Amino acid sequence: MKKVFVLGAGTMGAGIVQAFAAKGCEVIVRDIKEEFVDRGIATITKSLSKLVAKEKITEADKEEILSRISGTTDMKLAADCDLVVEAAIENMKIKKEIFAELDGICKPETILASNTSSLSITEVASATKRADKVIGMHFFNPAPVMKLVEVIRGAATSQETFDAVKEMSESIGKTPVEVAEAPGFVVNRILIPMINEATFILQEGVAKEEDIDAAMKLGANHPMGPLALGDLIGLDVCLAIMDVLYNETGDTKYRASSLLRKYVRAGWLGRKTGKGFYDY
Amino acid sequence: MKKVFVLGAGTMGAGIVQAFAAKGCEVIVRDIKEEFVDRGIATITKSLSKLVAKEKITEADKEEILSRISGTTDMKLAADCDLVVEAAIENMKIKKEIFAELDGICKPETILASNTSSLSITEVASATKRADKVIGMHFFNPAPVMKLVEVIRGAATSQETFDAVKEMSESIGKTPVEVAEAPGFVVNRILIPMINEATFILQEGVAKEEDIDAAMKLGANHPMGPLALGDLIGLDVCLAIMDVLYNETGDTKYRASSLLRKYVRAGWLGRKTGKGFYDY
């Protein structure tokens, strides 16, 4: 593969763009308004020169990265990409429309991947005439740094598509891992209920915030506590995944705490709002 | 507090003794046969030899730490101590006997503490005439290394007993965390169901063992994968904790997977039997 189309210039999207571009790929990023497109190319530029500002790479690098990246608000520029990675809104009806469009636009070889945290690759695939070519390719924030890629096979995803996405992952310096589509895949299915369990502990008067977090840091050697991790992931993203696990499985085991819900309702979403489990 | 009595010379009591003694407390460890007491001291000694080789302590420190440690079989030797920490077996009728004895034996001032991971402190405290000075002091293996202590207040634990146990934890360079007694406290309540989640994922054909573990290390920056981690903790201990959580809560959220329960029945308990989720 040489060329990649990335939908969404949000923070995941922008990270995905940088992860591909930084490793020699051509990347066209597409969003709904060029203010959005511009914001992302900015995010990356910032990102890169923070790196130059630690000798990690050079300006010759920084510039050759950025030359690999174009922006657009027009879906039609996906036509010739060898890969598409969709990092757009976590909404199935929309995703289905997006993928139906890419299917009409892209050359028959283009592989269409979602970065969806939660949602059905299979169902998305079914909106297309190339189910064998649709797959999940799931990165973790910040995508330039986190080395894991979950490669999620839908029911109809072929051995060849899997192999290609697996190879692509390797060539951009990540470690791919095979997942048969199921709710939450592997990482979030394990990780998010951990955070939710911390909010039950808090709700129930068992321990206060800083104690809960020190407990997992010093008691299990976790790099962050679950409440802080929450604030980093975004509490709305946390909530949404718990609601998807619960809804998919029908299993109350995955019920989100009322407390997590209250916080999301209050707009105390974490770092990005200045307030989550902690005041920032 | 300078004087600590530790019940039980298995590896948790031994590890604990070493923790108190490596920071200058005088410690008596007591067990039922003199041979057990001696395995415990031998353990601590091998542990302290490891530190000397790693140039972490000197021989002088080693001998110096051993010098504040006395073995015994005589429960009466607790009478004068400032703090008792019990690390005897996880059986309630016995704990109640043990704490009831210690109640008779000990000077009114002595705090009585249990390292129990899954029995009720409140329930043990009720077997004494001293509930206000009963408390959980929960270490993590290896006790000499793991900086966290969960300090578990039973319903009657005085603020004073709590404050004393906080200070003492801090004296030994550990970070205490206040926990109002509830099933699984903080750490195990989060950590064990995480492992159990991994087992369900495995059971359901979502991903293979190596992938589940690679995903958490690389996707979440966990120091080990959950299955490897279940093997290290012991699958029997994992199973048992999940059962406790489920039995205490009535909440089927905490139900162990059949597969975990099958591995326990096979004697595939982890590193300690040379086989759990992996072969060792």
Residues ≥6 apart with Cβ < 8 Å to A207: A201, A215, B177, B178, B179, B180, B186
CB atoms within 10 A of CB B23: 14
Tell me, in Å, the resolution of the deposited structure.
2.0
A221 labelled binding-site residue:
no
> Which residue in A196, A152, A144 sits closest to A174, CA to CA?
A144
Of B177, B187, B206, the CB nearest to A186: B206
User: From CA B208, how far away is CA A190, in angstroms rounded?
Assistant: 15
CB atoms within 10 A of CB A274: 12
> Which residue in B150, B118, B147 sits closest to B136, CA to CA?
B150
Q: Is the peptide bond before B142 cis (omega within 30 degrees of 0)?
A: yes
Residue A213 contacts residue B246 (beta carbons within 8 Å)? no
Sign of the torsion angle spanned by Cα atoms B74, B79, B80, B86:
positive
User: From CA B17, how far away is CA B9, in angstroms rounded?
Assistant: 9
How many alpha carbons fall within 13 Å on the CB side of residue B16?
Answer: 30
Among all residues of chain A, which has the CA nearest to that of B180?
A: A206
Report CB contact under 8 Å: B215, A186. Answer: yes
Sign of the torsion angle spanned by Cα atoms B45, B51, B56, B60:
positive
Question: Where does residue B77 rank: exposed (0-12), middle (13-18), buried (19+ CB within 10 A)?
Answer: middle
Span between the terminal Cα atoms of chain B, in Å: 43
User: From CA B190, how far away is CA B105, in angstroms rounded?
Assistant: 37
How many alpha carbons fall within 13 Å on the CB side of residue A272?
Answer: 13
Q: How far is A68 from chain B (nearest CA, A)?
A: 27
Please indicate the experimental technique that yielded this structure: X-ray
Query: A16 has which bridge partners?
Result: none
CB atoms within 10 A of CB B236: 19
Domain definitions of chain B by residue range: 1-187, 191-276
Tell me the one-letter amino acid at B215.
A
What are the tokens at B94?
């016995």
Fold held by A191-276: N-(1-d-carboxylethyl)-l-norvaline Dehydrogenase; domain 2 (1.10.1040)
Query: B135 has which bridge partners?
Result: B113
Q: Verify whether residue A222 is a known catalytic residue.
A: no
% helix / strand / coil in chain A, to the nearest 5? 50, 15, 35
Residue B118 contacts residue B244 (beta carbons within 8 Å)? yes
> Which residue in B177, B245, B168 sits closest to A215, CA to CA?
B177
Q: What is the CATH number of domain A1-187?
A: 3.40.50.720
Sign of the torsion angle spanned by Cα atoms B195, B201, B203, B206:
negative
User: From CA B110, how far away is CA B97, in angstroms rounded?
Assistant: 17
Enumerate the residues of chain B whose CB falls inside 8 A of the CB of residue A228. Answer: none
User: From CA B24, how far away is CA B118, in angstroms rounded?
Assistant: 29
Residue B213 contacts residue B227 (beta carbons within 8 Å)? yes
Residue of B138, B169, B196, B257 with catalytic role: B138
Residue A71 contacts residue A9 (beta carbons within 8 Å)? yes
User: From CA A110, how far away is CA B270, in angstroms rounded?
Assistant: 45
Report CB contact under 8 Å: B178, A204. Answer: no
